[PDB]
Structure formats: C-alpha cells, structure tokens
Amino acid sequence: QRPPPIGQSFRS
Amino acid sequence: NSEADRQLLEAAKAGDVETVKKLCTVQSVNCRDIEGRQSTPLHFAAGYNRVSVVEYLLQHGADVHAKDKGGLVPLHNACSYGHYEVAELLVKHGAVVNVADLWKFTPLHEAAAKGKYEICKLLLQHGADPTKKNRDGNTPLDLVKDGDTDIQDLLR
C-alpha cells in the first residue's frame, strides 16, 4: 500500500 | 541519524535556509532520514516547496536521482504537490522524468492524479510517457479526475 509522498501543496 | 543530520533534514523541511547553510557538508547534503522513509534533504525541500533550499542543495551536490525507501525521487514529491518551479529546477538539473517508484508510479502519475495541468505539460514537453502503467495497470490518464477534462485532453 503506497503512502502519500513527503510534502504538502500549500505552504499555509 | 546523528543530531546534525536530523537538524539538517528538519531545516530542509521548514525552509530554514541559514540552518541548511550551516549544516550542509559534503557528507550530509545527501543524508537520509533513517527514522523515516530515508528521505534526503532534497526530498523534503522539494515536497514542501522550499525553493531557496532546493537551489542551495542542488548547487552543493544533492543527488536529483536519489530514491527513498519507496523508490520516490524528489521530482515525485514536487509533482504530487503541484510545486511547478521546483519541478522545473529538478528537470533542468537532469532529473529523469519517466522515473518509477516501487509501485511503478511516475511523476506524471502524480501530476495527473493531483490535477496539476502545467506540471503535466512540463513533464510531457520533457518526454514523459502518458502510456506508462503502474502496478495497478493504470496509466497517468487513468488517474485523472472526471472534472479535469483539460488534463485528459493534454495526456490523450
């Protein structure tokens, strides 16, 4: 099962 | 991880440029987050859109091709989260656009599923293959949200 990649879309 | 590498990884994640500059050595620029998925500083900076840190790490010898424990490279992270400038920086520095992780997901799978038209376009201009199937048998086109007809058109 593939986890979400490290990071996020919004800096806020 | 040593305390120094831990601080480096956190600083890359936070976009703390000055701390990155203090701790980035030839030995640490490609260190790996052992407690986690073995992400490098560049994986963190890319995923969290820390542009100044991405540029600094690349200038100082960070490996654009470095895979984490899941086989993801920093470009996967940038594309998944719509960080266009980061994606362009990685690609300009030679990042492989058709790179596949352990599940055979490519950066284009990420950008397509996440509804990122301009990144999809960038990747395609650099030879990204819209026909590449992942482990589930799905192409990037297969992953596009119903409402994203512009991305469907682009990939078809």
Side-chain angles (χ1 to χ4, degrees):
Chain A
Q1 212 76 246
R2 188 180 184 263
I6 296 291
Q8 72 194 40
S9 301
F10 271 11
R11 271 159 286 155
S12 63
Chain B
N1 285 115
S2 64
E3 182 61 25
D5 290 357
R6 187 191 66 69
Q7 291 186 9
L8 177 57
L9 295 159
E10 293 289 358
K13 175 173 175 186
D16 182 354
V17 160
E18 300 305 313
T19 298
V20 171
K21 290 182 177 171
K22 292 178 180 295
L23 296 177
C24 185
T25 65
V26 296
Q27 186 172 346
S28 76
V29 59
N30 290 305
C31 74
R32 300 165 70 80
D33 183 15
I34 301 303
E35 294 94 354
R37 315 185 200 175
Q38 313 173 2
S39 314
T40 63
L42 182 60
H43 279 94
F44 279 105
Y48 285 100
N49 201 9
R50 307 304 191 191
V51 169
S52 292
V53 168
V54 170
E55 183 162 47
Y56 186 86
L57 289 175
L58 291 173
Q59 281 165 340
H60 291 267
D63 181 9
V64 283
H65 311 292
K67 277 183 169 177
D68 65 20
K69 185 178 128 57
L72 280 73
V73 298
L75 183 59
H76 277 108
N77 301 348
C79 292
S80 200
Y81 300 117
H83 307 323
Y84 180 97
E85 173 171 7
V86 170
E88 196 168 86
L89 294 175
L90 295 172
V91 166
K92 185 70 168 174
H93 286 80
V96 174
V97 305
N98 288 306
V99 55
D101 65 15
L102 288 183
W103 296 265
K104 297 186 177 199
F105 277 64
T106 68
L108 190 57
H109 281 101
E110 289 290 355
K114 300 298 200 73
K116 307 299 180 189
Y117 176 95
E118 291 194 59
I119 293 189
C120 281
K121 187 177 175 179
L122 172 71
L123 294 170
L124 289 165
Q125 288 175 328
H126 286 268
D129 182 354
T131 72
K132 248 194 167 193
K133 299 188 181 177
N134 62 18
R135 187 181 138 270
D136 302 321
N138 288 319
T139 70
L141 180 64
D142 286 328
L143 298 194
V144 177
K145 255 61 168 48
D146 277 20
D148 284 334
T149 61
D150 54 351
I151 296 177
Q152 296 175 346
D153 297 343
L154 179 70
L155 272 49
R156 284 186 323 233

